[PDB]
């Protein structure tokens, strides 16, 4: 619920940590134009945990929502905001013709039409230098061989659906097994020992027996995997003791 | 809770009628066949059925 987001070339990233992620507050909003998660299901975020989750905010001309996706190309994808091929998150985009658009023309958004090289994923280029397209050294002024690379939008409500300003929110979270802080509204039970019971520490479901071994985990280490990448040892999120996950009889 | 269906509301709050047609495709005596015509029943010959 922000009145104005940032520009595409100057997209702002919001760091989230020590949170209780209840994504039910987002579903009651207006029907989004594109709610697609590339690594998970949108109804399963409330039952999982995330190590580092970042929220990006930027507004495009609407029809360019297809460019905010892994493996896409275009003016926004190659110059302003690029997504990696291994992206794991959700993309949220909705219409904002009533907020970020004016009948006389809203000129508070740029998209860096021209750039010398293609931008790498998760980078920000807010340089306002004159794009030297010709051979003569541009002296910082507009000329026949160098123009302003930062072009303004013509957002007006008179344009049909597709040219209106669309606010895009990219939630980039890390689901790798690691010490995390955001672990939803999942509540806790007690700690039984030496019995075949289920375990759900940070979304890792399964069945095993806790033995409280003597493995020495480092502060940045919480999960341990065997040869077959099966998690056989975990660090309790609450208590600093180490517990092994051995299969039952 | 009751709905506040009013024509002044835009898309997202207008009443939308939903019809769910649940079928059963398992082989069983059916009586809801489509509008297809029936033919003659030939026998003892390689034909489509």
């Amino acid at each position: 619920n922000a009145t104005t987001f940032a520009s595409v070339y100057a997209w702002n990233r919001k760091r989230i940590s020590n949170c209780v992620a209840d994504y039910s507050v987002i579903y009651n909003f207006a029907p989004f134009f594109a709610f697609k998660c590339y690594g998970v299901s949108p109804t399963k975020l409330n039952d999982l945990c995330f190590t580092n989750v970042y929220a990006d905010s930027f507004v495009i001309r609407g029809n360019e929502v297809s460019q905010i996706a892994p493996g896409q190309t275009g003016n926004i994808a190659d110059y302003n905001y690029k997504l990696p091929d291994d992206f794991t998150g959700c993309v949220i985009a909705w219409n904002s013709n009533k907020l970020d658009s004016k009948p006389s023309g809203n000129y508070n958004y740029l998209y860096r039409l021209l750039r010398k090289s293609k931008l790498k994923p998760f980078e920000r280029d807010i340089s306002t230098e004159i794009y030297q397209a010709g051979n003569k050294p541009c002296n910082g002024v507009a000329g026949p061989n160098c123009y302003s690379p930062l072009q303004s939008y013509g957002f007006r409500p008179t344009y049909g659906v597709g040219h209106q300003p669309y606010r895009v929110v990219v939630l980039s979270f890390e689901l790798l097994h690691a010490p995390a802080t955001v672990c939803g509204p999942k509540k806790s039970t007690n700690l039984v020992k030496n019995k075949c019971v289920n375990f759900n520490f940070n979304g890792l479901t399964g069945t095993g027996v806790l033995t409280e071994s003597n493995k020495k985990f480092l502060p940045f280490q919480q999960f341990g995997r065997d040869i077959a990448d099966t998690t056989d040892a975990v660090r309790d999120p609450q208590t600093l003791e180490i517990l092994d996950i051995t299969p039952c009889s | 809770q009751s709905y506040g269906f009013r024509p002044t509301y835009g898309v997202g709050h207008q009443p939308y009628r939903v019809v769910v047609l649940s079928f059963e495709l398992l082989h069983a005596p059916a009586t809801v066949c489509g509008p297809k015509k029936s033919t003659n029943l030939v026998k003892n010959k390689c034909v489509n059925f």
Partner: antibody
Amino acid sequence: QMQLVQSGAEVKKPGESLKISCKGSGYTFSYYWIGWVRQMPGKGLEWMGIIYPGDSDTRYSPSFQGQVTISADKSISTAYLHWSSLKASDTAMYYCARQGDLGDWILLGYWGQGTLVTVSS
Amino acid sequence: SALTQPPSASGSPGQSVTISCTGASSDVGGYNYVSWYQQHPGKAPKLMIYEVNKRPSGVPDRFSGSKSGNTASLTISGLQADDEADYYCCSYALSRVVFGGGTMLTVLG
């Protein structure tokens, strides 16, 4: 020329409905957010909610969600403010504001004249 | 959140005064979501200063604005007789406008 004209002063009693209006002219009444601001005698300004003339997208204040309703007529370019079951504390000066050609969508650069409610029982 | 403004201010003609405004919220868009309004007794308010690094048309350069952290400042270079009015600051960051207490303006004692 752009200008906002409101209804005259209305004096009623508690337990009676009230629906004041504020018509805007000189501009396209389809893209500018129209809202209402309450100002009690001797107090500051209090925002209640805004509406969109194009389609009904009402964002009410958390202290004025179900206490008051706001509507508009795009055919005649007139915004309304309907009340139900008025109380003794509702007597105040109410303005209608709209966004300008520059600023945010809730900047409210333009204003009207003022319709004061005067009650108590 | 709710904004806080001094109850009243005083200033002799010719000098400058400053109005404080503490409590403005913020979002992922920026920190310049502070606007000022002037309302004379008996009429509707008027937008004096919005986007403090800028100002609307038809407003003299006497009205200036600034912001340092969570505190906003309204600087008026020249004080005149027609400046006695209530000045309110507004925070419009989280899609919600909040008007402060206000400070009635008048001159020295």
